[PDB]
Design a protein around this nucleic acid. Structure first.
Lengths: 125, 174, 96, 242
RNA sequence: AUUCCGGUUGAUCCUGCCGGAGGCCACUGCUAUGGGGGUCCGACUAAGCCAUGCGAGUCAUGGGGCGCGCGCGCGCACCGGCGGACGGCUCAGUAACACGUCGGUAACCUACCCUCGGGAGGGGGAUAACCCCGGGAAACUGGGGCUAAUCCCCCAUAGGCCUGAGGUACUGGAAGGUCCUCAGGCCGAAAGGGGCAUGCCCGCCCGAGGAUGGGCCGGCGGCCGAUUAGGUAGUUGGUGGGGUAACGGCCCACCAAGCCGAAGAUCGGUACGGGCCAUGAGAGUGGGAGCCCGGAGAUGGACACUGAGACACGGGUCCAGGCCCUACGGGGCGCAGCAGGCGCGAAACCUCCGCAAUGCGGGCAACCGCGACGGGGGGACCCCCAGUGCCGUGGCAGCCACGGCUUUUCCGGAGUGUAAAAAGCUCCGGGAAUAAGGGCUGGGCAAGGCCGGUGGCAGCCGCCGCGGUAAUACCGGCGGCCCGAGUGGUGGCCGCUAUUAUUGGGCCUAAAGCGUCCGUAGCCGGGCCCGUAAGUCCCUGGCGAAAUCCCACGGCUCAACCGUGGGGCUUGCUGG
RNA sequence: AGUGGCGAAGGCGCCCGGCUGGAACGGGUCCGACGGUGAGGGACGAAGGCCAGGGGAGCGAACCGGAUUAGAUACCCGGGUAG
RNA sequence: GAGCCUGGGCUCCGUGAGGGGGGAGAAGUCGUAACAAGGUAGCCGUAGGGGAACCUACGGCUCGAUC
RNA sequence: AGCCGAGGGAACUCGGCAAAUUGGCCCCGUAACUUCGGGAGAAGGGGUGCCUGCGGGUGUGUAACCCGCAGGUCGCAGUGAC
RNA sequence: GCCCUGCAGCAGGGGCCAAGGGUGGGGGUGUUCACCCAUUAAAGGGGAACGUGAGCUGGGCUUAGACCGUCGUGAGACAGGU
């Protein structure tokens, strides 16, 4: 259970005793480690706080690449140089900021696929 | 916090066995036919509150201050303790005998409707006395200035007939 | 506080007085501790047997302590088997 | 620990703008959400029962309301929790009665009787402005209502002007602007229920609201917030006020 | 009333402590007639354990069937919808952005409600109820057949979200915001239903805003301990990400060594916070159960489903600790809800009546329900008003006899009152009848220098001190003083106390100047001129809920109580 | 030799010489407020005692004796270790 | 992430055979230390001794009387 | 003279005699008492193989000797025997 | 398996015939014995070179080493302890 609510320590280094139980409002969820798929792309739909909706990607195959206003749709090859974690490139995990290899070339991801359910990228010079 | 309880409207003496005060209060109780010490202290507390308000309002600056001043003086006039041309400094000359004179028992005595304070108390408690249009049974009602000329015997009352034996005996004195 | 009696006793008064004040050792039901309590009145010690139930009050003294002639005691008896010891002494009652 | 919204109101915790005995019973009617705020409104049940005296019990008041006899802004209102607020009209045709809801110099709501002709107009203060899809202009008013206008006449409306409207059909009439000689009536604050002419406006930095100076009808000046000034005319009021 | 008195000596003046004398709270001894009003009655020890009954339903104008009476009308369960996350109870835990006040969210969610702008097209399916079989001690539960909807699903269109390139129409103090254009993609609505009628009422979906209720952030304020001195290691920050409704070391990978602290950190102790309450002339000291606002909890601990909203007080799962039924196979419960019972104790009520008033839920409505709420019952809870006789003649020294009067109160009756009763209020009959005690009596301290009994024994005594054969001090009687339906005892707080001293105390000899000096922080600092305006003073704007406190007027006979209005309180914050 | 003097206090007395600290007086000299007190910290501080090494006349705790005394672990007398 | 076991950290109360000093109470036994110059003036600091109050030595003070 | 033994675990015996347990290296953590030097390797806890690569130290060094990191994989067991 | 009883029954006392079978496990002590614990139908007692060292053990006892107490001038000693 990801509680995501508060730290049990002051900046002075002292301890804080929780004076109540954990509330359902404060909880989080497990991360969507979005990988490059093989033949299918998988999505999930989540019901949230106010009856609202979220879309998760689990396996991705296509990306929307952009170069100066006009955009195209292509396939994703290997991931290159995710600067948020060292294991993510080897494991071919896509997050915002990752550099991917496509049919055209190299592109920087500008979207959060764990929140939006889509991979959008800007082409590199 | 704590909520408010209701508090007494009378105060007791600081020491209970002082000869001067004992003698004074004994004389007053005997002369005015008061049941117990508690009544005296009630009237004395009324007077003390008047005096404290006067002391506080005296030489104080403010519209609310002059408002309170006029209200105090008019309330005193209406109760019948001061006249219409009176100044704040005239409150510090009042006594408890004034309040004791302004009550229904003493007034029923002075007006010749009874021969004794005890007889007056009995009449008031049994319901033979009517203020302008109302029977009242509390001997400490503190008649106002606008009702002292409207006190007489109740409509339905043995004492309302000119030829009642006790009424004759009462009139004997006057 | 309530208590159970164990032993009647008599304490010698302080100088320059001379007398024997009758008292009783009492075991408390709250905690099991034993204290000594004075029996006021003439003959009060006759209206008290052992294993009788007893109610205990403070005796009344400077700084919530002991009184003049008998230092060492702090408590006095109020009731014996749920009956007032004053009534017992005066004879206006009979203990069960 | 409360796990959800409230559905009850105690009398000692009711707002000061009401005329209500607080130590008589324990419960009060909790107003339902609606046009005006909670501090500036009052339910219809109290207007029908305790103000005008057309009933002694809530059952009778509710029967009266459900029979379709009370109008607000020209519309039948059957909910006994519906809140009535400043500048609203309460009308009863079976008695030809018409009232405008206004505040006192203390901050409490009273009913001022008016005529059947002035009972057809209600002024609305503009609180905000928005662009909506299709390029239309949406004005957000003081009672919480909204009105659409076109892009061509967007400069003829601003965020403190007043618009007079025929209330059941809601057609616009007689826009009144915020200027330096306009007549205003104060709705909230310490100078509530006063009226006068504008003299000066003052702006401030970083979120602090603007202020306005007003001249009384006899020569005395005072100040208040520009959000509490309700324009009602140019040099002469356009409604019957007390 | 801005107060004093007793006690160290053979006698005196001081210092200093003890005690008396006042008020409020809890327990208790003796005693007790009446009415009214109010926010009182298992808080102090066991947030310990619970038998029995009740505390949350409602909709036939959503749907199908079944039974009863002349297609129509009544009644029952089922499907379905809304609600059950409020109201009610307690004070264990918590020294914390928990609380209070001022501000912010341009970093967020919101079913029921309001306004405006728009929509409702085309298809399909299952299954309770019902019929045929049952299983099981129970709790519960299987198979086959048949069926409807405002039940469930699919297609479409609108719409929602992400990214990129442009235009600069809106608000505001200020645009990662709204609007327009183009492009690439993901998700993806709706009950044209029910009723009346020859259009109206109640409803369904989308968008923009508001309202209601919440989430998060900040500045300021608020106990004791040094025989508790160094603490912190995701700890402090940064870059990049994940997750969230949302900002954030909330979490992760990498790069640094930072953060708190003698102006007292950390650790420990005690404790729900405030509005308010008691006391005092005030300065101040102490408390914060009952009414309101807020917080937390539901035997102890942890974890989830459904829903706008819960990690759920009368819903779920596991462990620990207790209990109940059993056909021994298995099953069920935790009153800090109202009554009621056990136990713990010095210490706390009836297993009552009603939805007539105030309110909440459901319903178009009519209305139904509610141990909330209202009404009574028991209780020396608090406050207000009264009573237990009055008059006259004579007598004695307040009371006796004689005669007369009255009926609040008491006994009985008729009306009104009340959801129904009862109390109360008007009236009738009878009749001085029916109703005072508790403490004290040597001096503080008010009232006996009377009788008897006992005889350092017995007993008394806040303190001083009485008692050893003539006792004003013990016990009893007779007298007398204080208060009085109340009066005494024990514990606690304030005052007394200038014995905690800012106002306002002391240090040669009574308690008290470090053995002396140097100096760090801190506190205190010479005169004149110029400037600034942080402190400081005046004026004005926005806030500091209500109740509680003061005054006046008005309504219950007056009053306590309730209502209208004016001031105050909120120890203060903030814009000029 | 003082009823005197110097020193922050403790304390300091034969003469001569050298090195050194502070104060008073006189001053139309210089600087121009550079000051007071001082928690915490520091330095000095009689006698006595302790450590290590030297010395040791007189006096003298402990101790050894003689007297007094009812008793004398004391006062008086003769010696004497530490110091 | 409960619960169980286990190894430590802190701290309040609980209980324990038996020893030391303290305080009251009776006043019992040995002496006569302090109050007069108390019969050796008294008291502070340090050290040694002694049944007990106490003795002695070095330094200090008068809160010491007399000629 | 040696190796293994289910369940129990000193009930054996004067007596745990004999046998068994632990064991190398790195990191965390470490009491009473004390002649302050010690006790102390106190106690107690976690890890360790093979393969594929990445870095540091001295050095001119794709010479030599040492110190760290990540990932993949097998077994009942990685100081696997000694 | 039987007899008497101050044997109602359950159990107890006392005595007769019977040696076929049984009579065990633990704590302190070198112990035998005695004492205690929990079980048990009961947990009898003796003899056989005080049965049994060309069967085991070696705790005691009874050489040569050493310590304490006491006795003795001493060398030393103790049906005393270790």
């Amino acid at each position: 259970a990801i509680w995501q609510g508060r730290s049990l320590k002051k900046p002075s280094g002292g301890r804080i005793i929780l004076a109540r139980k954990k509330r359902k409002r404060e909880l989080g969820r497990e991360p969507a480690n979005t990988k490059v798929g093989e033949d299918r792309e998988k999505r999930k739909i989540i019901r949230t706080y106010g009856g609202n909706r979220k879309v998760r990607l689990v396996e991705a195959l296509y990306a929307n690449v952009f170069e100066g206003g006009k955009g195209k749709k292509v396939k994703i090859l290997n991931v290159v140089e995710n600067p948020a974690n060292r294991q993510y490139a080897r494991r071919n995990i896509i997050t915002k900021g990752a550099i991917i290899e496509t049919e055209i070339g190299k592109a920087i991801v500008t979207s959060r696929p764990g929140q939006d359910g889509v991979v959008n990228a800007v082409l590199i010079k | 916090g704590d909520p408010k309880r209701q508090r007494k409207k009378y105060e007791t003496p600081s020491h209970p066995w002082i000869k001067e005060r004992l003698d004074r209060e004994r004389v007053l109780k005997r002369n005015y036919a008061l049941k117990n010490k508690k009544e005296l202290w009630r009237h004395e507390t009324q007077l003390k509150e008047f005096r404290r308000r006067a002391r506080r309002l005296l030489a104080a600056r403010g519209k609310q201050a002059e408002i309170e001043r006029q209200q105090l003086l008019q309330r005193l006039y209406r109760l019948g303790l001061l006249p219409a041309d009176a100044v704040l400094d005239d409150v510090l000359s009042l006594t408890v005998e004034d309040v004791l004179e302004r009550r229904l028992q003493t007034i029923v005595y002075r007006k010749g409707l009874a021969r004794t304070m005890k007889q007056a108390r009995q009449l008031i408690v049994h319901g033979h006395i009517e203020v302008n249009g109302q029977v009242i049974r509390s001997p400490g009602y503190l008649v106002l200035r606008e009702e002292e000329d409207t006190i007489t015997y109740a409509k339905g009352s043995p004492f309302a007939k000119e030829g009642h034996p006790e009424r004759m005996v009462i009139e004997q004195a006057k | 506080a309530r208590g159970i009696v164990l032993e009647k006793i008599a304490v010698e008064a302080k100088q320059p007085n001379s007398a024997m004040r009758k008292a009783v050792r009492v075991q408390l039901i709250k905690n099991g501790k034993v204290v000594t309590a004075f029996t006021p009145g003439d003959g009060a010690i006759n209206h008290i047997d052992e294993h009788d139930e007893v109610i205990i009050e403070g005796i009344g003294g400077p700084k919530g302590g002991s009184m003049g002639d008998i230092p060492g005691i702090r408590y006095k008896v109020v009731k014996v088997n749920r009956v007032s010891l004053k009534e017992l002494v005066k004879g206006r009652k009979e203990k069960p | 620990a409360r796990k959800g919204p409230k559905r009850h109101l105690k009398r000692l915790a009711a707002p000061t703008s009401w005329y209500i005995h607080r130590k008589a019973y324990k419960w009060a009617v909790r107003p339902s959400p609606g046009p005006h705020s909670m501090k500036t409104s009052i339910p219809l049940i109290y207007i029908v029962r305790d103000y005008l005296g057309y009933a002694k019990t809530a059952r009778e008041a509710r029967k009266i309301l459900n029979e379709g006899k009370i109008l607000v802004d020209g519309r039948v209102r059957k909910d006994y929790k519906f809140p009535v607020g400043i500048m609203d009209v309460v009308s009863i045709p079976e008695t030809g009665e018409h009232y405008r809801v206004l505040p006192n110099r203390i901050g409490k709501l009273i009913l001022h009787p008016i005529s059947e002709e002035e009972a057809k107009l209600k002024p609305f203060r503009i609180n905000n402005k928005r662009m909506v899809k299709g390029a239309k202009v949406q004005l957000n008013l003081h009672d919480g209502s909204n009105h659409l206008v076109s892009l061509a006449e967007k400069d003829a409306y601003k965020t403190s002007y007043t618009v007079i409207m025929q209330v059941p059909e809601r057609q616009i009439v007689k826009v009144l602007p915020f200027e330096v000689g306009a007549y205003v009536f104060v709705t909230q604050g310490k100078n509530v229920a006063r009226k006068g002419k504008i003299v000066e406006v003052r702006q401030f930095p970083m979120g602090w609201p603007d202020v306005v100076t007003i001249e009384d009808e006899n020569g005395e000046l005072f100040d208040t917030l520009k959000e509490y000034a309700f324009v009602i005319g140019k040099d002469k009021p356009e409604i019957s006020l007390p």
